[PDB]
């Protein structure tokens, strides 16, 4: 169904420790396909997925060229914001930039966005309409007035609705075997006595893709969202994902509690329960 391409830029000043570190990473939905590391030896946008490697030399010359320029801009930006906030050249600060486009089943532009942050906090974001900006504070306001006069939103827009989707469609096609598949979650359940009086039921879900998924526990057809442990969805590392949800129940009710798996990768929701 829906698809997206997102890029993430992180710059961290390092007073005394030399010039700032600039790291970049490209994601097509839940798959990273490229990266750039101002510290590495290559100094080239590098591939991080099989399907993207097939792009030719001029693609990589272009990405490295455009990424270098992007890091130079964030390097000056780093010293500029230090001033806007009257900080010393002693601490290390960070600038984060994330932007991308979303397309629906027919690969037609759906949503587009761009947001920048300073020291983990919002700085300036492009509005939903892709025509104006939203500044977080007075320092960000300086940048806003300028970007509005320099027509920055228009360049961002022409890209989000244009090349951004153009490349997402080409990526979704050149790497179908990875990007368009849907790996359903291989379920399973475990029980661990806590005591002769209580025990823990853990609902597993490994090797699934995309990451989107929902594990929920129920009391005879009643969901219990406040006595159940649930961890953050995590990367197995092979490209797939995993997750589990737990619950603590009396020594006699392990047939009153059902766990439901839901993932676009499986025709019908699962209703696991111990035995």
């Amino acid at each position: 169904g829906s698809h997206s391409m997102r890029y993430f830029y992180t710059s961290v000043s390092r007073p005394g420790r030399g010039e700032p570190r600039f790291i970049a990473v490209g994601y097509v939905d839940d798959t990273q396909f490229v990266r750039f590391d101002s510290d590495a030896a290559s100094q080239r946008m590098e591939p991080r997925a099989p399907w993207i490697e097939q792009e030719g030399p001029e693609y990589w010359d272009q990405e490295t060229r455009n990424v270098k320029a992007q890091s130079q801009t964030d390097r000056v930006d780093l010293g500029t914001l230090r001033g806007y906030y009257n900080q010393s050249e002693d601490g290390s600060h960070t600038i984060q930039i994330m932007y991308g486009c979303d397309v629906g089943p027919d690969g037609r532009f759906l949503r587009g966005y761009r947001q920048d942050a300073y020291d983990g906090k919002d700085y300036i974001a492009l509005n939903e309409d892709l025509r104006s900006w939203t500044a977080a504070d007075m320092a960000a306001q300086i940048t806003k007035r300028k970007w509005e006069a320099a027509h920055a939103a228009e360049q961002q827009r022409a890209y989000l609705e244009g090349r951004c989707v153009e490349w997402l469609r080409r990526y979704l096609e050149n790497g179908k075997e990875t990007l368009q598949r849907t790996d359903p979650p291989k379920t399973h359940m475990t029980h661990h006595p806590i005591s002769d009086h209580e025990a823990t039921l853990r609902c597993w879900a490994l090797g699934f893709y995309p990451a989107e998924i929902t594990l929920t526990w129920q009391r005879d057809g009643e969901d219990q969202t406040q006595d159940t442990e649930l961890v953050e969805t995590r990367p197995a590392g092979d490209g797939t994902f995993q997750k589990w949800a737990a619950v603590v129940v009396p020594s006699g009710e392990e047939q009153r509690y059902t766990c439901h798996v839901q993932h676009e990768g499986l025709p019908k929701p699962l209703t696991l329960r111990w035995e």
Binding site: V34, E63, N66, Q70, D77, D116, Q155, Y159
Partner: peptide, 9 residues
């Protein structure tokens, strides 16, 4: 791929 027109802040 990536955006090539980011302006200074």
């Amino acid at each position: 791929a990536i955006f090539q027109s980011s302006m200074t802040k």
